[PDB]
Design a protein around this ligand. Structure first.
Ligand SMILES: CCCCCCCCCCCCCCCCCC(=O)OC[C@H](COP(=O)([O-])OC[C@H](O)COP(=O)([O-])OC[C@H](COC(=O)CCCCCCCCCCCCCCCCC)OC(=O)CCCCCCCCCCCCCCCCC)OC(=O)CCCCCCCCCCCCCCCCC
Lengths: 63, 171
């Protein structure tokens, strides 16, 4: 292989791996903040569906 | 928290319908016939406000219209009504079915002297509409502001940037 080929192939490898390492650190920080705050699409533990509530008039008024 | 507000004892004084349950049960069909409007304004206010403190005055109208219901019995047909609720009052389950001739005497004297038609089978269980002037409660549960929902997903789905990014797996 030419020194140009090895050199530029090395630069492409280094770009891909630096992007992956920065993305791994960002993945760690995103998971930390989403577990802390719960305002993202991850760690959305379920609550009760409010469509299960009967909103009809009941037998007694005070409810 | 706060102090729960309660009305005074003068706000709760009304002339009570001081008659027995067999007396109420004897005249109950003509009561539901003739005392329709204030009773239904009260029960509409009672299921809508969900608060009896906001339903006192309408309730007083109930206790205003019930007494005038019984005075109008007492002025005209006291004896057939008395003969009827006594027979209702004998039964331990208070059967209407044991008391049909006294019911017929009371209904005859009421239709003659007051023009009242007894409700049929299926009438007093109707859902009727009520025209009141009081406004609709905009928050009957006194609920505070609901929390804002989480942001939904938008944007077109792109591939994963250089795959799994799991240690050395390039896909
Ligand atoms: C126009 C449309 C049509 C076009 C058609 C074009 C193609 C025509 C030809 C069709 C055939 C295609 C063949 C598959 C594509 C090339 C695969 C390849 O070379 O991957 C390179 C891959 C990484 O090299 P690369 O330079 O990064 O990528 C070059 C290519 O672009 C490779 O692509 P990549 O960069 O995208 O690589 C992705 C990624 C690259 O990998 C990574 O990023 C790293 C992760 C790899 C896994 C590491 C696991 C380590 C722990 C387990 C070790 C197990 C024990 C070792 C094996 C013992 C025996 C089983 O892959 C993986 O992570 C998947 C796992 C590895 C699978 C490799 C394919 C295996 C097929 C044959 C299986 C036979 C055994 C193979 C060896 C098994 C062990 C791997 O090499 C290895 O991981 C080393 C293993 C050797 C590769 C397998 C070669 C396949 C042919 C073997 C023939 C001889 C068989 C002899 C008998 C059986 C053995 C006893």
């Amino acid at each position: 292989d030419a020194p140009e080929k090895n050199y530029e192939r090395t630069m492409a490898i280094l770009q891909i791996e630096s992007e992956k390492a920065e993305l791994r650190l960002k993945e760690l920080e995103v998971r930390r903040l989403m577990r802390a705050k719960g305002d993202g699409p991850w760690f959305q533990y379920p609550t009760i569906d409010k469509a299960l509530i009967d909103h009809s008039p009941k037998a007694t008024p005070d409810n | 928290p706060g102090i729960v507000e309660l009305p005074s004892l003068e706000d709760l004084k009304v002339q009570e319908v001081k008659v027995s349950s067999s007396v109420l049960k004897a005249a109950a069909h003509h009561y539901g016939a003739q005392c329709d409007k204030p009773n239904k304004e009260f029960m509409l206010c009672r299921w809508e406000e969900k608060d009896p403190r906001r339903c006192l005055e309408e309730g007083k109208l109930v206790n205003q219209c019930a007494l005038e219901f019984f005075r109008q019995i007492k002025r005209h047909c006291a004896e057939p009504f008395t003969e009827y609720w006594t027979c209702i009052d004998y039964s331990g389950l208070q059967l209407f079915r044991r008391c049909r001739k006294e019911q017929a005497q009371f209904d005859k004297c009421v239709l003659d002297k007051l023009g009242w038609v007894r409700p049929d089978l299926g009438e007093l269980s109707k859902v009727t509409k009520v025209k009141t002037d009081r406004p609709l409660p905009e928050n009957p549960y006194h609920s505070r502001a609901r929390p804002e929902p989480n942001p939904e997903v938008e944007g077109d789905l792109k591939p994963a940037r250089h795959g799994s990014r799991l240690f050395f797996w390039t896909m």
